[PDB]
Structure formats: C-alpha cells, structure tokens
C-alpha cells in the first residue's frame, strides 16, 4: 500500500506533543470525514492540509485527529500514524482511518493497510473492526 | 524520555519510501557515530542534520541509517523511528540506536528509551542488546 507521509502533504507538526499509542492496536475504526471528494494527489493533498488546519485551529485538537486518511486518489495519507493516539471524542486505543469520499476502491485499500499492520505487528491478530462509514 | 522528532531537527524526508519494521522489536543495537560530541540541542541538531546528509549523499542510503540517535545534550533524536527498518549492512529487524559522543550519560537515556519501547509494546520484554560501541 502506497502511503503519502506527512512531509509529502506538507503537514505541520502537532501543535504540542501527542500521546503514544500502546501496541499492538486491538481496534480499528473506519470513519467518514464528510468533506469534498478528491481524485488526484495534488487535490487530495490540499484537502488533507485543510483538514489538519481545521482540526487544529477550529476544533482545538493538537493535530489532525485521525491516524490515516484514505482518499479518492487511492492513496493513504499518514495522519497521526501508527504510534500516536487520536484524542476525544475518538478512542485513544483505536487506529482511526478516515475517508475522503468513501468508496469500494479506497475501502479495499484501507483493508490492505490493516492486513499489513497485522503482518507487521502494529495491529493485533485479535482485533475488532468498527465500520462507521455509513452514518 | 524527551524525543526530538524529525520536524524539530529539520530532517529531510527519505529520498524514497522506507521498509517497515516488524514489531515487537527483538533486538536493539548500540552503535557509535564517531562524530564530535555535542552538548546543546542547537549543536546536536546540527550534528544529526549532518549525519543524515552524510548517510543519504555519501553512503547512498534512503535516509539517516539509524532508528534513534542519543546525544550529549541528553536528548534522543528520532531518526527512522519505531516504524521503519535500517538498510544493509544493518539488520532489518533491529532497532539501531546511534550515539554522538558515547558516554554514561548517553547510555542512561538510551536505556530509558528501551524501557519506554517495552512499555509501549514497540520492543520485546525479552529483547537482545547488541553492543557495537567498540
Ligand atoms: Na560525498
């Protein structure tokens, strides 16, 4: 799976340091961002930057409040990543994968990411998948 | 343990994507950098930037070829970090911790990092410690 890391989408650092996530992760959650779809890396990159700015400045979060973001360009964007927890109202012990324009396509990509996470020991073999994409 | 993350030492990104590191890590290796000691974060940041440039440009590595760097300013610098393995001749399953001006000071902080890694599930409770400092 192709991950667009933080530097490649011009991420700013967390405004203050994030809290470490205990591994292996035992719960994964798929959520919808309910922001405009995007279909190229340039377009999706721009959207992720905006998401981060909004989460930090408008919401008062320390950083973009997901671990990863699947987008319409079929890329996974690194958000808080494997090792740091999201903050409330998200669960600190879940890997949160957000979706910009959820679809059959990027859902399969996100599932591939989970499979890799399991193989690499980031995600427990005994994990729960919480699919909130319909809401 | 205070970790100076990549953005805070002005790291460039890997030249190309790195290989993922499997967890839990079963082996930690201590290696010497053979670079001048540094005693302030300003000075150590400069040294770590220089190490990364050296590894990428002179050695042809994709990125600084350590996971963490322990320095004389008593800081740990995030290099490849928890998630990505070092490339050859380093082992793809080890956590490589480099030392700038290796000392009893450096070692204590490095051991704290390991203890933190174990608590967080990054490192096996039964990890091997490979000492390449000499
Ligand atoms: Na050279």
Curated annotation (Swiss-Prot), chain A:
| UniProt induction comment | Regulated by the imd/Relish pathway.
Domain of life from the UniProt record: Eukaryota
Q: Where in the cell is it found?
A: Membrane
At which residues is glycosylation annotated? 126
What protein family is recorded? Belongs to the N-acetylmuramoyl-L-alanine amidase 2 family.
The protein's role, per its UniProt record: Peptidoglycan-recognition protein probably involved in innate immunity by binding to peptidoglycans (PGN) of bacteria and activating the immune response.
Q: What is this protein called?
A: Peptidoglycan-recognition protein LF
Organism this protein belongs to: Drosophila melanogaster (Fruit fly)
Query: Which residues of the parent chain are present?
Result: 234 to 368 of 369
């Amino acid at each position: 799976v192709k991950i667009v890391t933080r530097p490649y989408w011009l991420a700013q650092p967390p405004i203050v340091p994030l809290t470490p996530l205990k591994l292996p992760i035992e719960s994964v959650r798929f959520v919808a961002t309910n922001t405009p779809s995007c279909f190229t890396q340039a377009e999706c990159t721009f959207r992720v930057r905006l998401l981060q700015n909004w989460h930090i400045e408008s919401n008062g979060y320390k950083d973009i409040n997901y671990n990863f973001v699947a987008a319409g360009d079929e890329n996974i964007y690194e958000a808080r990543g494997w090792d740091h927890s999201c903050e409330p109202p998200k669960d600190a012990d879940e890997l949160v994968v957000a979706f910009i324009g959820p679809s059959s396509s990027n859902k399969k990509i996100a599932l591939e990411l989970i499979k890799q996470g399991i193989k690499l020991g980031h995600i427990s073999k005994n994990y729960s998948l919480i699919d909130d994409l319909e809401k």
